[PDB]
């Protein structure tokens, strides 16, 4: 699994469950859809892509924080958290993008490994 996403909720002290994650890749010209999914009961999203699909490029991972907070009855500030990075440029790597969410703040970090 070359691209994994893990999301935690700083208001509830829990995994962020059933949060939508969309991945786009930058096109020749615009953001083209690449892969999407929803976080699990552990806050994790595995199975986005495959080694064969995951080419070099500039990717955007957008986590739908607005829907997540609204469904919980919380007022979100950010529409979404938008993590943008160059992948695979010096060869294939495995990436984990972790995100910690609050209504008016988020943080995100990357773990990169060389398989």
């Amino acid at each position: 699994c070359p691209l994994m996403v893990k999301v935690l909720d700083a208001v509830r002290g829990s995994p962020a469950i059933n949060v939508a994650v969309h991945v786009f890749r930058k096109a020749a010209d615009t953001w083209e859809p690449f892969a999407s999914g929803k976080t699990s009961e552990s806050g994790e999203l595995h199975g986005l892509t495959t080694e064969e699909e995951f080419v070099e490029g500039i990717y955007k991972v957008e986590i739908d924080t607005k829907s997540y907070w609204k469904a919980l009855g919380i007022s979100p500030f950010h529409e979404h958290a938008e993590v943008v990075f160059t992948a695979n440029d010096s060869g294939p790597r495995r990436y984990t993008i972790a995100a910690l969410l609050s209504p008016y703040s988020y943080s995100t970090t990357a773990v990169v490994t060389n398989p």
Copy 2:
């Protein structure tokens, strides 16, 4: 100011100086405002009360150029940052492989 940006470096423990910041507003992204961080890591003067209407905004901080100037290989292209406005300070704390961003209303 209706909108202020502050950028801090978590590796060196210093303000992030001369970092480019662009703000965009969602149209029916229209560039909306931009500048470069001061010696204090702050950017004031972006907009006015008149122009800053309710809507969806994106603040994008060119973190990649900042790290490269320092000789450090960064992960991200930029710390974007996207919110609905319904006085705002947007703060960003930068590391090579992480960032956090927060909004404060005064």
Copy 3:
């Protein structure tokens, strides 16, 4: 000031007002300075250039009392925060189950 503390609330998007802050210095923890956050979430006036010598300091922010006043059940007792000093701003961003803290030197 040699030492400033700022506290922000990540749930409400506001400065954290009237939060108690205690600073301690490691002895051969001696209370060193303390106060309460202003309407801006800031605490100035903690110490002087004379008293603030190199050493190991702990800044402890009473986050539990802040959340309880708001009617929110918090995880932490306090966001402590412990560093070696060799002008410092200590910033803390608070959520019920998380905090982050950063130091900036000017």
Copy 4:
């Protein structure tokens, strides 16, 4: 496993490997040693304690960031990151403490589950 700790490195984009973690419990009078260990190659520390040992109380988890950064040739600011919470007060829970480290900043969050 009622108490787990996971640590990531924001400078390197990696797990924080072989970082010392000490847990103390507040005593009747002072911090009494409770449990300690080192993070794994995945940045995780399992096996700190057992359900039988983990009683209600005020715990301090101290992560030795100073040694970790010094061994990597980086200048640390914080001596250590000191996470302090009441545990088990309304009954036993499982706790994960996650920490993201940089030289001049750290964040930490809790995931609490009711087994």
